[PDB]
Amino acid sequence: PGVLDRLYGHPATCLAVFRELPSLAKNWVMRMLFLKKEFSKAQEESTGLLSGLRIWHTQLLNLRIALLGGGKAWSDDTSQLGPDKHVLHFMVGSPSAAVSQDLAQLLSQAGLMKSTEPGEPPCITSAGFQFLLLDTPAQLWYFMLQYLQTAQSRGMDLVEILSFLFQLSFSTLGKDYSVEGMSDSLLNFLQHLREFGLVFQRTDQIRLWELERDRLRFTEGVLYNQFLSQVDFELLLAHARELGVLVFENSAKRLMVVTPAGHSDVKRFWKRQK
């Protein structure tokens, strides 16, 4: 048993060392998970701590019963930690951790209902800007939060949960864009919402790739330049289009050249200064 602290300690060390910048922690945290853990963990640096926090509840899945209750005891501490901490990476970590605590069923529905974290998931869910990666953890959190409630008889949270309704505008967007990944996440929210509270609530194709190619055909939107006063001003204005990579054509014997519309303005500015 004297060995136990030492071995696991070395991995605690490794995680500590490359704790700050990237996402090294995930694999190592898992190993750490098996072997007042939460109380002691709290002192350690946040990232990675959260990673360990995330995976440990997952890992639980007799003495096990004891473990769950023990975890339930300091669910608050992690919750206090979760907020306050609140990049995309961090954001992913906070909801992933929250989601994980939720499936454990340790979290108190009350308390959760009135908390910043629930506002934050729908906030990111609402905004178009968030990336697909943030979206999936946000979505998962919501799903898990609703999953946590297997009652709704006594669950204030299943009120705030209603915040999903706000999402429809977001789904309209997303749909407008070809973001299939952003739509699927929405559907999961809907389906899960219905699930919890459902009781309460009332060759041939060769011509088709050719027909696709008929919808693509080229030309470019473009400025032409002519009647240039002397050769040095063609060559300067031409070299300064070529380094901008927006020369479509050039002919030095014409003293004539062509720029596509996206670098009309960098040329209009260079023509004014020098």
Binding site: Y224, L228, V231, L237, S251, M256
Partner: protein, 62 residues
């Protein structure tokens, strides 16, 4: 040499189709407006608004 600028569309067609567009330009009704000039055999300065028409007409035509 930044004497003159002209927004136009530069068409980079092949040495086969280009003359077809030219033909489109002439012998046509409400046309001849289409091509500003032939900068190269491959490229032409053309249209703007006409580009939709030129492409479509080429499509419809053989």
């Amino acid at each position: 040499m930044v004497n003159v600028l002209k927004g136009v569309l530069i068409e980079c067609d092949p040495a086969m189709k280009q003359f077809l567009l030219y033909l489109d330009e002439s012998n046509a009704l409400g046309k001849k407006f289409i091509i500003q000039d032939i900068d190269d055999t491959h490229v032409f300065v053309i249209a703007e608004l006409v580009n939709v028409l030129q492409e479509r007409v080429g499509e419809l035509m053989d």
